Design a binder for this molecule. Structure first.
Ligand SMILES: C=C(/C=C\C[C@@H](O)[C@@H](O)[C@H](O)C/C=C/C=C\[C@@H](O)C[C@@H]1O[C@H](C[C@@H](O)[C@H](O)C[C@H]2O[C@H]([C@H](O)[C@H](O)CC[C@H](O)/C=C/[C@H](C)[C@@H](O)C[C@]3(O)O[C@H](C[C@@H](O)CCCCCCC[C@@]45C[C@@H](C)C[C@@](C)(O4)[C@@H](C[C@@H](C)CCCCC[C@@H](O)[C@H](O)[C@H](O)[C@@H](O)[C@H](O)[C@H]4O[C@H](C[C@H](O)[C@H](O)/C(C)=C/[C@H](O)C[C@@H](C)[C@H](O)C(=O)N/C=C/C(=O)NCCCO)[C@H](O)[C@@H](O)[C@@H]4O)O5)[C@H](O)[C@@H](O)[C@H]3O)C[C@@H](O)[C@@H]2O)[C@@H](O)[C@H](O)[C@H]1O)CC[C@H](O)[C@@H](O)[C@H](O)[C@H](C)C[C@H]1O[C@H](/C=C\[C@@H](O)[C@H](O)C[C@@H]2C[C@@H]3C[C@H](O2)[C@@H](CC[C@H]2O[C@H](CN)C[C@H]2O)O3)[C@@H](O)[C@H](O)[C@H]1O
Ligand SMILES: *[C@@H]1O[C@H](CO)[C@@H](O[C@@H]2O[C@H](CO)[C@@H](O)[C@H](O)[C@H]2NC(C)=O)[C@H](O)[C@H]1NC(C)=O
Ligand SMILES: CC(C)CCC[C@@H](C)[C@H]1CC[C@H]2[C@@H]3CC=C4C[C@@H](O)CC[C@]4(C)[C@H]3CC[C@]12C
Ligand SMILES: CC(C)CCC[C@@H](C)[C@H]1CC[C@H]2[C@@H]3CC=C4C[C@@H](O)CC[C@]4(C)[C@H]3CC[C@]12C
Ligand SMILES: *[C@@H]1O[C@H](CO)[C@@H](O)[C@H](O)[C@H]1NC(C)=O
Ligand SMILES: [Mg+2]
Ligand SMILES: [Mg+2]
Lengths: 291, 996, 32
């Protein structure tokens, strides 16, 4: 039943020789024309959008609160006694913070010195090539309290006091707006700088909150949040080496051999949340220092 | 050993009819005049079984449900489900939270199979239900003589060997051996097929137990006369009982449409497994693991199984079947609606199927002129000439010199289809006078009868003397009728143009040739004459004689002749002509005498004018038939006597070298043999019959056509198509609908198979280039089980692109339903453009949100990660899991909409195979409704509140609906120029490679 | 802000289109 091998009419696999050439040539021309038409339509579409401004951004609003080190299942578990069980977090933290090294922000044509205290949004202008490349607000690695990779390369994991550097999702043309102190009656006690997007970490249930211990916030000017002098973002085309604001949270005095789930939330008018997106404006990290 | 029982039943029957009255009563042990004692009845009744055929085997209701639930198409769906469903069972007992991508799919495929089974069961059940409301048969008891006393008992209470008396009007209970008859004429129509009622004589006449006159058969009605007989066979042991049991034990076979469906599944699996294995090699070449390679192979084979094609095909066949049901062309087999379209040889029955099985007045001879009376069933033929006085004389002789009339309830019934008591000839005459000369009720009493002389064996005559009607005053009218050669001798005066003339040989021989003309035409002639007794020489009051005949037997006035035969049905000739126009070979298979079969064949179209048989040429050359060459004869009459002594090779020789064949005097078993011979050639055969002798032929054939009323219940149950209106034109309608639905099936299948390319390609490249999923599974279900349902169904309402009844029947081994050209067009060209349009929309959406098409390469790795909430786009922005996932779902929805957009043009191009869309016109209202409903349904699936939460199909930005427009327009233009080139360049490479 | 899309207007327009297309199709199939 599978002897379509050959025939007296010079058939191979089912058809003759010249027939194979005719059909193969037709398919080559046909598929080539189809590919050319598709690439041409894709070119016109590429011409539709711009180089420094996406046509749609409502799918990225509000931004999300990401945490470093990034962890699978958002669990940061290790044995403080063993320097090997926490090497993954150290590697990821070092890899991410290497872009913020003191030596990385050398040139002035790209890196601009910005205030040591949070200031107003530094608007560099418009989104065009008229003003060429843009300035980047430098972020000193020392602004992170005890997890800087400057004095303790481990960042605290050596003596059971980890650090989870928090970061804000980059959004082109986004201007964070901290909540006015007039409406300050819902979020917990935090430092109030009208130029700082606040971030506060807490537990999740009546047990996690109790077993957490003591939170230690580290940031620019000692404010638990992000300074407004670093926004808005101008895309990767106008600001190639832009450094976003960072913040660190150290969980000193954590219950050993116990997994505690903590949630850090960034408050603000421009910051929303979602019951389906566990990372929109907030994030969850369950840590366990099982020595 | 049932293979031998079937052959034993196939063998012609034998009997013990040729036995002396003493020998017969000796073999069965029964009194010739008193029958048997009542105690002797219980000795046989509880011995072999009541006189009744064993009911057919019963197949419980749920059996058909399971039959449709399994099938062959449903089996492919069952295996596809099985793979997908068995995967989730192993997944549930191990992980914490799986995905429904395969579980929901498996349950959906299973539900599809079950739903199709439910719908099919409902339709077939309705067919059987209406068939049951039409087969309401009531018991008929027999008049048995036991202990010397007459008693009417149920037929089932009759046993073997007990005197049975059958009166004129009673149906023969069981097979009887006539011992004493009085002019009994049984109607062996349903059993042997003999149209003209055959008389039963107690004396043995022919060796054949059927042609002989001393045997009464089961299911035969005694037209007239009375007779006595001893029961020979009972229950299933009877002739028709054995024939019925043989029919119940025959194999139905494989319908042509089922074989086409199987071939289609074969090609489907061919591409499925081919793509699966080739992509398995490709996946491994891309350095993927064997675990993933097996996963891919299974996914490719499964994704290549058309789920929605089952319901579409079922409803597609149901629509045409309903159109058949509207014209009384009921189909018990759902797939039997197409069998007619593939038929290339129709074997028809003569008596009952082609003819009306009703002796009717055909021609009349008066004033030396033949007058053909209309022989139609609905009275829609050319009216004869009735203005001369001779017509009045003939009508008087016929209406007056006739024993009986209609019955009690025969008042509202039509003149033709109403019952009449008496001989068939008398009924034909009565109907002719009732339709051409007013009425016979008041015409018979107006001429009071005095002395009537019925038919006699010696000096055969049938006359009667009546009184004068009005004031003409001749005072008497003696009417007589009989054989033309006998009535001609006892006549001297001849009525012509109104007056009288002598018996000159000049016109006497004209009458002779007229008799031979009507005889050779295939009719039964009867001469009619009357005479006015001169009241001056014979009294006006009371003067008659009966023992020493006084009325002048000779010197009568001959009026004319009246021929008669069972005429063919109204639409039979035109239907045969139409079937021959489409290339269908019409072959007659009857058990009637050849003298009548040849004439009916020449009159209906089975034998055209000019074509001579092996006998016609010999008669035209005055030479023995053994001299002429059979190749010179286009048509031929095959006698059943010679067919018995034939081999398998000779039958093939008869069918090949002869176009117009007429099989006469063929037993039911020989009909089955002829059917098998026709099937040996490899051509589709369709048998049309009515009597029980057609049951084996209607069962073995690819499709049997039975008469709703003129057909017996046995052959009606053994057939596959019922004609409730008996309109033989339904055969022409059925073949037209079969070919039409075949073409529409090709179109709908192409439409469904074209959507699989842009369905599988997103997942294929999702694995190949490692890009975010362009199209999800839920959307695929919304396409094959949603939008495309109506367009695929509406493609069945399409109509002929040319004269379908002009082309030859399709070749089973050459013209396939789904060939490689269809795959080349759907999977090769149209589907490819649809896939390109979908990818265009995908890149458009992603690039507009910041993820340029270039940046999407290799992004799936971290795109599917649920914890990498800082995915950078081409603009440097960081996206969380749910944000990019929302973009993926709002991208999948647009891909589905793109599928609908390209499906518009795909439906338009698949709507026609050769003609242009403008030559055919989009007059298919269901198709336009399909486009509107499809578009509206898609828009609803995207903008309904809660879809991004229920089906994860987010609303689309309006500017997306025009992304696939240029692609659909391109598809339409390309296929249009393709069909235009095929139209202006037939037989070219374009047609030989793309015409599906 | 450019970070807001009037999904309500487009959604309502889509529902309106679906209703109109469906009733029009019904008119064509239930033609008189
Ligand atoms: C039930 C299912 C199955 C699984 C369900 C699953 O969920 C669950 O049940 C779980 O399992 C639950 C099970 C639990 C079990 C136990 C647990 O309770 C217990 C717990 O488990 C936990 C673990 C659990 O947590 C885990 O995570 C489970 C997960 O597992 C999966 C994994 O995560 C993931 O898969 C990774 C897999 C893994 O990595 C694979 C490993 C390899 C296989 C293997 O190597 C490993 C290993 O070695 O195997 C060993 C076993 C051996 O005995 C076997 C013998 C080997 C045979 C060798 C023969 C090979 C072969 C075969 C020949 C025929 C041909 C031939 C060529 O190859 C020939 C050649 C020979 C000569 C080769 C000889 C090589 C020999 C190799 C062997 O010896 C071994 O490798 C060797 O022994 C090794 O040990 C050794 O190290 C070797 O190393 C080296 C070799 C290496 C290896 O060989 C390699 C690389 C080979 C490479 O290919 C080579 C290449 C480079 C290449 O050759 C190359 O060079 N190319 C060079 C190219 C080049 O230059 N090019 C240059 C170019 C120049 O131009 C070295 O070289 C060698 O020498 C050396 O020997 O011979 C042994 O075990 C070990 O040894 C093992 O390590 C994932 C899950 O399964 C599971 O979660 C534990 O952590 C826990 O502690 C424990 O308690 C069904 C699934 C679903 O049903 C399915 O649907 C699926 O879900 C979807 C598809 C999802 C997909 O899609 C998703 C998105 C949407 C989907 O949802 C949608 O559904 C998609 C749909 C689908 C369709 C279509 C469409 O879309 C939609 C529409 C359809 C609808 O619409 C339609 C209408 N149209 C209708 C309708 O159909 O439906 C997405 C998904 O992502 C996606 O997947
Ligand atoms: C950061 O690290 C230093 C260590 O260099 C911490 O020093 C603590 O000093 C206080 C005050 O005497 C002691 O109570 C603690 O025991 C010291 N801790 C350790 C680990 O040595 C210091 O508290 C840390 N945090 C801050 C906010 O400065
Ligand atoms: C040979 C000629 C006729 C082909 C010309 C191609 C035209 C018809 C094609 C090429 C580029 C296409 C456009 C490219 C970009 C966009 C923007 C998008 O948001 C919707 C589709 C839309 C609006 C396309 C519509 C059709 C379009 C204008
Ligand atoms: C035979 C073929 C060409 C008919 C093509 C139908 C075209 C004209 C119709 C069918 C589907 C329609 C779209 C369906 C849904 C929407 C969303 C709505 O909120 C605005 C209109 C919009 C964007 C429609 C525009 C017009 C449209 C594309
Ligand atoms: C952890 O340490 C702080 C130090 O100020 C102490 O007040 C607190 O009670 C401790 N909490 C737990 C839960 O051990
Ligand atoms: Mg018949
Ligand atoms: Mg059959």
């Amino acid at each position: 039943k599978k002897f379509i091998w050959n025939s007296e009419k010079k058939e191979f696999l089912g058809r003759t020789g010249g027939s194979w050439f005719k059909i193969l040539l037709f398919y080559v021309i046909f598929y080539g024309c189809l590919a050319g038409i598709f690439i041409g339509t894709i070119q016109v579409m590429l011409l539709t959008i711009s180089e420094f401004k996406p046509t749609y951004q409502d799918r990225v609003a509000p931004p999300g609160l990401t945490q470093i080190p990034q962890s699978q299942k958002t669990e940061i578990s290790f044995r403080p006694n063993d320097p090997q069980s926490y090497e993954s977090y150290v590697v990821s933290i070092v890899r991410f913070l290497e872009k913020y090294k003191d030596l990385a922000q050398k040139d002035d044509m790209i890196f601009e010195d910005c205030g040591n205290v949070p200031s107003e949004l530094k608007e560099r202008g418009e989104y065009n090539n008229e003003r060429g490349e843009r300035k980047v607000c430098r972020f000193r690695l020392e602004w992170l309290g005890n997890c800087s990779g400057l004095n303790d390369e481990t960042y605290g994991y050596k003596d059971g006091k980890p650090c989870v550097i928090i970061k804000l999702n980059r959004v082109l043309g986004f201007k964070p707006k901290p909540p006015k102190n007039e409406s300050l009656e819902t979020y917990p006690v935090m430092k109030y700088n009208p130029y700082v997007l606040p971030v506060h970490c807490t537990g999740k249930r009546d047990e996690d909150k109790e077993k957490v211990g003591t939170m230690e916030y580290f940031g620019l000017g000692g404010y638990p949040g992000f300074p407004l002098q670093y926004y808005p973002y101008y895309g990767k085309l106008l600001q190639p080496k832009y450094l976003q604001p960072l913040m660190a949270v150290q969980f000193t005095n954590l219950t050993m051999d116990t997994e505690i789930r903590i949630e850090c939330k960034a408050y603000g008018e421009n910051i929303g949340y979602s019951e389906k997106d566990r990372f929109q404006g907030r994030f969850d990290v369950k840590i366990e220092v099982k020595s | 050993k049932e293979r031998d029982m079937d052959e034993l039943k196939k063998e012609v029957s034998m009997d013990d009819h040729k036995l002396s009255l003493d020998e017969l009563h000796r073999k069965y042990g029964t009194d010739l005049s008193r029958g048997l004692t009542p105690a002797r009845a219980a000795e046989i009744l509880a011995r072999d079984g009541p006189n009744a055929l064993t009911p057919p085997p019963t197949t419980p209701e749920w059996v058909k449900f399971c039959r449709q639930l399994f099938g062959g198409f449903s089996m492919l769906l069952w295996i596809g489900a099985i793979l997908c469903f068995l995967a989730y069972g192993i997944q549930a007992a191990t992980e914490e939270e799986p995905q429904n991508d395969n579980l929901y799919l498996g349950v959906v495929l299973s539900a599809v199979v079950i739903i199709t089974g439910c719908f099919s069961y409902y339709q077939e059940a309705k067919s059987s239900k209406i068939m049951e409301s039409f087969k309401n048969m009531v018991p008929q008891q027999a008049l048995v003589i036991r202990n010397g006393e007459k008693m009417s008992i149920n037929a089932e209470e009759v046993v073997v060997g007990d005197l049975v008396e059958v009166k004129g009007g009673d149906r023969i209970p069981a097979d009887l051996r006539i011992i004493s008859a009085n002019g009994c004429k049984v109607d062996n129509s349903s059993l042997t097929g003999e149209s003209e009622p055959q008389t039963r004589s107690p004396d043995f006449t022919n060796e054949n137990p059927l042609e002989t006159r001393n045997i009464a058969f089961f299911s035969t009605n005694c037209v007239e006369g009375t007779a006595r007989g001893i029961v020979v066979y009972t229950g299933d042991r009877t002739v028709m009982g054995r024939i019925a049991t043989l029919a119940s034990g025959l194999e139905g076979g494989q319908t042509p449409i089922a074989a086409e469906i199987e071939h289609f599944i074969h090609i489907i699996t061919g591409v499925a497994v081919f793509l699966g294995v080739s992509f398995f090699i490709l996946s491994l070449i891309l350095e993927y693991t064997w675990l993933e390679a097996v996963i891919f192979l299974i996914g490719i084979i499964v994704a290549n199984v058309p789920e929605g094609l089952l319901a579409t095909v079922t409803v597609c066949l149901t629509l045409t079947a309903k159109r058949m049901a509207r014209k009384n062309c009921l189909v018990k087999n759902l797939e039997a609606v197409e069998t007619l379209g593939s038929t290339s040889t129709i074997c028809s029955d003569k008596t009952g199927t082609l003819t009306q099985n009703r002796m009717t007045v055909a021609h009349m001879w008066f004033d030396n002129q033949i007058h053909e009376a209309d022989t139609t069933e609905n009275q829609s033929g050319v009216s004869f000439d009735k203005t001369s006085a001779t017509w009045l004389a003939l009508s008087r002789i016929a209406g007056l010199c006739n024993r009986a009339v209609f019955q009690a309830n025969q008042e509202n019934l039509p003149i033709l289809k109403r019952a009449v008591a008496g001989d068939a000839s008398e009924s034909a005459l009565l109907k002719c006078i009732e339709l051409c000369c007013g009425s016979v009720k008041e015409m018979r009493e107006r001429y009071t009868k005095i002395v009537e002389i019925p038919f006699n064996s010696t000096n055969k005559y049938q006359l009667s003397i009546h009184k004068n009607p009005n004031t003409a005053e001749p005072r008497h009218l003696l009417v007589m009728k009989g054989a033309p050669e006998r009535i001609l001798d006892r006549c001297s005066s001849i009525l012509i143009h109104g007056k009288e003339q002598p018996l000159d040989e000049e016109l006497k021989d004209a009458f002779q040739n007229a008799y031979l003309e009507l005889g050779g035409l295939g009719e039964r002639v009867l001469g009619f004459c009357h005479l006015f007794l001169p009241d001056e020489q014979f009294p006006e009051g009371f003067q008659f004689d009966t023992d020493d005949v006084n009325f002048p037997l000779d010197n009568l006035c001959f009026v004319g002749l009246i021929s008669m035969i069972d005429p063919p049905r109204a639409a039979v000739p035109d239907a045969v002509g139409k079937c021959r126009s489409a290339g269908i070979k019409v072959i007659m298979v009857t058990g009637d005498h050849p003298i009548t079969a040849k004439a009916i064949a020449k009159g209906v179209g089975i034998i055209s004018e000019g074509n001579e048989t092996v006998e016609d040429i010999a008669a035209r050359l005055n030479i023995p038939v053994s001299q002429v060459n059979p190749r010179d004869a286009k048509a031929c009459v095959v006698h059943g006597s010679d067919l018995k002594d034939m081999t398998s090779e000779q039958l093939d020789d008869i069918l090949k070298y002869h176009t117009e064949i007429v099989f006469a005097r063929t037993s039911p078993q020989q009909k089955l043999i002829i059917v098998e011979g026709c099937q040996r050639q490899g051509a589709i055969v369709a048998v049309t019959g009515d009597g029980v002798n057609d049951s084996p032929a209607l069962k073995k054939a690819d499709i049997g056509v039975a008469m709703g009323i003129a057909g017996s219940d046995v052959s009606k149950q053994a057939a596959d198509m019922i004609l409730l209106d008996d309109n033989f034109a339904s055969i022409v309608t059925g073949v037209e609908e079969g070919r039409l639905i075949f073409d529409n099936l090709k179109k709908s299948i192409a439409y469904t198979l074209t959507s699989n390319i842009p369905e599988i390609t997103p997942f294929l490249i999702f694995i190949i280039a490692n890009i975010p999923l362009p199209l999800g599974t839920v959307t695929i279900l919304c396409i094959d089980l949603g939008t495309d349902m109506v367009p695929a169904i509406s493609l069945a309402y399409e109509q002929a692109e040319s004269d379908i009844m002009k082309r030859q029947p399709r070749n089973p081994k050459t013209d396939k339903l789904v060939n490689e050209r269809l795959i080349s067009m759907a999977y090769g060209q149209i589907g490819m453009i649809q896939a390109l349009g979908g990818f265009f929309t995908y890149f458009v959406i992603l690039a507009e949100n910041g993820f340029l098409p270039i940046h999407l390469l290799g992004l799936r790795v971290n795109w599917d990660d649920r914890w990498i909430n800082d995915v950078e786009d081409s603009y440097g922005q960081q996206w969380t899991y749910e944000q990019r996932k929302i973009v993926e779902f709002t991208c999948h929805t647009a891909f589905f909409v793109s599928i609908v957009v390209v499906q518009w043009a795909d439906l338009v191009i698949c709507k026609t195979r050769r003609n242009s869309v403008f030559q055919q016109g989009m007059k298919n209202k269901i198709l336009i409704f399909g486009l509107f409903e499809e578009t509206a349904l898609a828009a609803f699936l995207s903008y309904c509140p809660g879809m991004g939460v229920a089906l994860r199909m987010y609303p689309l930005k309006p500017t997306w609906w025009f992304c696939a427009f240029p692609y659909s327009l391109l598809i339409f233009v390309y296929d249009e120029v393709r069909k235009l080139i095929i139209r202006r360049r037939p037989g070219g490479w374009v047609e030989k490679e793309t015409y599906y | 802000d450019p970070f807001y899309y009037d999904y309500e207007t487009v959604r309502n327009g889509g529902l309106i289109f679906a209703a109109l297309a469906f009733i029009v199709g019904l008119i064509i199939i239930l033609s008189k």
